[PDB]
């Protein structure tokens, strides 16, 4: 409880790592700012190394030197009381190369990676002569792959009724030992959920998630 | 939270330029993309073009002409340009942010300025 | 290209009853629908987005459905701040059109 790195503390009371496998003002927990789930939520989704980019320090050491090897660990906790249901499904999926709601072309940079700010899913199809555009029916989770085979990759299930938060650890997962972060996003933090929040009258009608992101073993 | 606003000349001279722009306030413009919504007593509503997020623009198909979209990310407003003027355009002029989360649909709004062509 | 046919023309009912509306596109479009209320004079609020999920501070009282070409929207007991003019926009492709335009007069 009450870990501490650098000049933050976040306090903690399980936890599922990688593959198997264990991964200098840096290492500090970034916290990506909440986002709110309610009834009619489709999932989030944020690039892994362009989140840190655009607002720390590490993105500091991103513009001044551009290849490094990095090992990740995330912390994804959501609080609300015993009387809200619903279940969550929190993967990251390394290698997500999301396809084009336009058939012929490819998606625009600022449609696949908000800096530090979620992208959304829908549960539509949406539009295609329009731009640009990520194709985000979710049920396709916008690989082109059946949703419900998503669980083989690293995760973990929250559930409100029992369970109230997730860890991951993920190591450093690349064909080349040395790539330059600008033009390449090897990781892809998605959260979905399946059972859709339900509540009664009276109680709030939303409940956050915050996302706490924290880099060990920064090589430069 | 305080939403955008809207700044324009009001009254214009037939066959001519018009020129508002609107002012956000509280988002960025990375995030969200601007939408344009002529309103009218006679021909109901109709939409005119929007720029999207990343930069890139689509107009209507009857004003493809008349048109020119464009903003600025750290001044944080946009800019367009209807031109020619014509006597159909007594409507009141709207401007209006999308991308409600994450579905393109008109959220919030400007004020509303109509603009009149004649003397 | 693809039309939005809003009907019917305008209804007058009284404090309390569930009424109906509906609109009718050309082709398919997935869903894609929003419901806009335009009171007298003001700007537009957003109700209804992809044709059943509510907005965030709109209350219960409405609702919508329908999947296809045929969406309808359903209002289950009217107040005295619910009338004005209301709307269907199709958010499918370029060029994006709205519906006609009906009216509640609530006598």
């Known amino acids: 409880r009450s870990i501490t790195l650098g000049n933050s503390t976040i306090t903690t009371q399980n936890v599922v790592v990688g593959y198997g496998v264990w991964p200098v003002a840096t290492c500090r927990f970034y916290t990506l700012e909440s986002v709110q789930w309610m009834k009619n939520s489709a999932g989030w989704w944020w690039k892994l190394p362009d989140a840190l980019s655009q607002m720390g320090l590490f993105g500091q050491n991103m513009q001044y030197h551009y290849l490094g090897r990095t090992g990740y660990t995330i912390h994804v906790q959501c609080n609300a009381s015993k009387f809200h249901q619903g279940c969550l499904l929190v993967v990251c999926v390394p290698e997500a190369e999301m396809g084009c709601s336009n058939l012929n072309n490819t998606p625009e940079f600022s449609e696949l990676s908000g800096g530090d700010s979620a992208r959304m899913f829908t549960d539509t199809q949406v539009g295609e002569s329009n731009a640009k555009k990520v194709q985000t029916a979710v049920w396709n989770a916008g690989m082109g792959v059946g949703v419900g085979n998503l669980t083989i990759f690293p995760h973990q299930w929250i559930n409100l009724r029992t369970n109230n938060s997730a860890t991951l650890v993920m190591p450093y997962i690349n064909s080349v030992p040395m790539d330059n972060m600008f033009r390449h996003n090897n990781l892809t933090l998605m959260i979905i959920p399946f059972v859709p929040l339900n509540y009664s009258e009276g109680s709030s009608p939303y409940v956050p998630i915050t996302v706490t992101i924290a880099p060990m073993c920064a090589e430069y | 939270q305080v939403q955008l606003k809207q700044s324009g000349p009001g009254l214009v001279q037939p066959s001519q330029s018009l020129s508002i722009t609107c002012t956000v306030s509280?988002?960025?413009?990375?995030?969200?993309?601007v939408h344009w919504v002529r309103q009218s007593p006679g021909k109901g509503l109709e939409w005119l073009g929007v720029?999207?997020?990343?930069?890139?623009?689509d107009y209507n198909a009857a004003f493809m002409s008349r048109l020119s979209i464009t903003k600025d990310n750290s001044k944080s407003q946009v800019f367009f340009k209807m031109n020619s003027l014509q006597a159909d355009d007594t409507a009141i002029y709207y401007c209006?942010?999308?991308?409600?989360?994450?579905?393109?649909?008109?959220?919030?709004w400007g004020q509303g300025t109509s603009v009149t062509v004649s003397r | 290209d693809i039309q939005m046919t809003q009907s019917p023309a305008s209804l007058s009912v009284s404090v309390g009853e569930t009424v109906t509306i509906t609109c009718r596109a050309s082709?398919?479009?997935?869903?894609?629908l929003a419901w806009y209320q335009q009171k007298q004079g003001k700007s537009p609020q957003l109700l209804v987005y992809?044709?059943?999920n509510l907005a965030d501070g709109v209350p219960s009282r409405f609702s919508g459905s329908g999947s296809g070409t045929q969406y309808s929207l359903k209002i289950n007991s009217l107040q005295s701040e619910d009338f004005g003019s209301y709307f269907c926009?199709?958010?499918?492709?370029?060029?994006?059109?709205f519906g006609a335009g009906t009216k509640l007069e609530l006598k």
């Open positions: 209006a942010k999308g991308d409600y989360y994450g579905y393109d649909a008109m959220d919030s």
């Open positions: 720029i999207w997020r990343g930069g890139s623009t």
């Open positions: 992809a044709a059943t």
């Open positions: 926009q199709h958010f499918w492709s370029p060029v994006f059109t």
């Open positions: 082709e398919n479009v997935y869903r894609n």
């Open positions: 509280g988002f960025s413009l990375t995030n969200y993309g």
